[PDB]
């Protein structure tokens, strides 16, 4: 982002301008829709707008009942999914979140017992917003929505009297497809994904009920201001569970993430093979420490794979369920004289292949066996030819790099790039410490 520093000593790059936010825990939220006594009244006079929608609502209720009854069947002491519908349904939630689906499900078992939902309904009798405590000390924020029940009951049964249906209106029929949209989409999502939706949508929680349910958590005044502006990524990392249909209401829960850390410097380290130690003797080194890094409490957290973290410009949305704690002396491998303080793992072996590693600001390229690799752009097709490798090139100097008729694009972001002068590694590198470069 802000500054990239090139290191000839080990052929690596570091970008040091990323403020970060790390997830810490989950905040739950229990809803309760209303559909009312739609199952009782019947429409049996001509096919028209009202007739074709009542059957839709009743069929949706039937499908929701079937999928809720089938939801308490998959929980056969299952913890490791071994089915196509479940393995492919658990990877879209995030591998690091697979340990969070279990926590949500275990919370679901507590709240679907008797005398638990009874408390929730009692807590919502007079108001649509009432925080309630569970039996095991956990606090649950309960939200109630009553759009249909205040439409099916008070100003629908009058119109449909004596089963002389569909005749005495042409406008209320249009409104019956207005209040009915949310419930149909909710049941469709839950029946399509077996009750475990992959992310919140504007059907589970509208934009009004997300800003109100994020300013009711107990948090600082900065973690709230950050969420009320990153509510897109908040929606992207929270999943909703299904509790069931208890009579004529739909109860489900939705898990909102909590950002425990809001500002702390972070950096990316990216590497590629080192050198032609001796022309024909291609025995050169390779850092295997790439990934992310962030500070939380004076102990840097390390994510070995870059897919575990995202980016929204400066802010970095990592998580603390897959982080690996490293000593805060790990930043000393960037000034490499083969220091014995922190043993850098790096690697060992003699099979160097030409590689390209895309950097946030520039790009780094290595060509060893004499492959025709050339710097390219848009205004000029071929600008210059480079020799050997580890020649880091900016994204202002070049716009594409070509290696074995395979082009790579470069980013347009701008930052104060830096280069650290240093001699590359020599023929013999013994004092480098001991990694495990296998598997």
């Amino acid at each position, epitope marked *: 982002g802000l500054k990239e520093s090139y290191l000839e000593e080990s052929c690596s790059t570091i970008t040091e301008g990323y403020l970060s936010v790390l997830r810490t825990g989950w905040y739950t939220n229990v809803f309760t829709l209303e559909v009312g006594d739609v199952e009782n009244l019947t429409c049996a006079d001509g096919p028209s707008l009202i007739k074709t929608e009542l059957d839709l609502t009743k069929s949706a209720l039937r499908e929701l009942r079937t999928v809720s009854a089938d939801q308490l069947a998959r929980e056969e002491q299952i913890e490791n999914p071994r089915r196509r519908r479940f393995v492919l349904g658990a990877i879209a939630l995030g591998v690091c979140t697979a340990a969070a689906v279990t926590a949500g499900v275990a919370i679901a078992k507590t709240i679907r017992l008797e005398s638990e939902v009874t408390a929730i309904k009692n807590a919502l009798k007079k108001t649509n917003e009432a925080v309630s405590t569970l039996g095991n000390g956990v606090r649950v924020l309960a939200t109630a929505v009553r759009e249909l029940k205040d439409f099916v009951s008070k100003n629908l049964t009058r119109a449909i009297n004596k089963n002389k249906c569909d005749i005495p209106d042409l406008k209320m029929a249009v409104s019956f497809s207005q209040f009915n949209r949310r419930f149909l989409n909710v049941v469709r999502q839950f029946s399509d994904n077996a009750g475990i939706t992959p992310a919140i949508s504007l059907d589970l929680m509208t934009d009004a009920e997300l800003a109100r349910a994020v300013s009711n958590m107990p948090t600082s005044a900065g973690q709230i201001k950050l969420m009320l502006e990153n509510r897109a990524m908040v929606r992207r990392k929270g999943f909703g569970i299904l509790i069931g249909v208890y009579g004529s209401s739909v109860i489900y829960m939705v898990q909102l993430p909590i950002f*425990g850390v809001i500002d*702390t410097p972070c950096w990316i380290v990216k590497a590629a093979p080192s050198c032609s130690e001796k022309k024909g003797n291609y025995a050169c080194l390779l850092r295997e420490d790439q990934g992310w890094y962030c500070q939380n*409490a004076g102990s840097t957290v390390y994510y070995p794979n870059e897919k575990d973290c995202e980016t929204r410009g400066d802010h970095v949305f990592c998580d603390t369920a897959c982080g690996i704690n490293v000593a805060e002396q790990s930043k000393e491998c960037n000034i490499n004289i083969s220091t014995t303080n922190y043993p850098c793992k790096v690697s060992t072996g003699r099979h160097p292949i030409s590689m390209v590693a895309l950097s946030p600001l520039g790009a780094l390229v290595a060509c060893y066996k004499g492959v025709s690799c050339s710097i390219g752009s848009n205004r000029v097709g071929i600008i210059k030819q480079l020799n050997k490798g580890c020649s880091y090139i900016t994204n202002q100097d070049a716009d594409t790099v070509t290696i074995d008729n395979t082009v790579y694009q470069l980013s347009k972001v701008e930052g104060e790039q830096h280069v650290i002068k240093g001699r590359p590694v020599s023929s013999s590198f013994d004092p480098v410490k001991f990694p495990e470069d296998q598997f």
Partner: antibody
Amino acid sequence: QVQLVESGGGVVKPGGSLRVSCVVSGFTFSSYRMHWVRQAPGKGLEWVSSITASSSYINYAESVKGRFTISRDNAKNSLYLQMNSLRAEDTAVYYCARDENTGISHYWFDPWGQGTLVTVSS
Amino acid sequence: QAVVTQPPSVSGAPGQRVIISCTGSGSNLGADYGVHWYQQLPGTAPKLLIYGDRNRPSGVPDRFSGSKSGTSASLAITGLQAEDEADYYCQSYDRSLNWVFGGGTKLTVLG
């Protein structure tokens, strides 16, 4: 080993200015939010300011809003508290306290500094 | 919103039990936010006594215990000595006032 030293206290006329500092030592300064807590002579403690770990979100108390300004220097290990238009009801003792939190609902100032005194009289 | 209220002074006798209360309101302790206790000696800076409403940082001599429930918190000092004469403040978090401090009570031993 954590040790917070503040300096800059003195006597200043009403409607003046004064810049209090605080130097940290023994821990990573660029990872902790830091506060400024003041205590009138013989009264209870009161919170004054706060700045996150990278000078992004800054919160001021209600009575000092529009007159103070907190800053940081993550490389020189200090945080500063500019004052302006001081009044006679401002004299107090200022502490710089590191910030501790558990993540969700617990917030406390654990390693308080030493403290400096600011006298403001005509 | 509202401020945290504490009794002015508390008197005790050696070897007895002392209870210090910290009464909150509906916006700071009613929203599940902590109560934190600081002991200020007559000449020094405050030091942490209890964090998280029940825990103890290393150094506190195991005779200080706390409890929070609803909109109140309490501190219990078992076997009061002659060296525990100080001021005790209770700290929370309020929704609209970012950090609220209590008035502060002073424990006086009658030996």
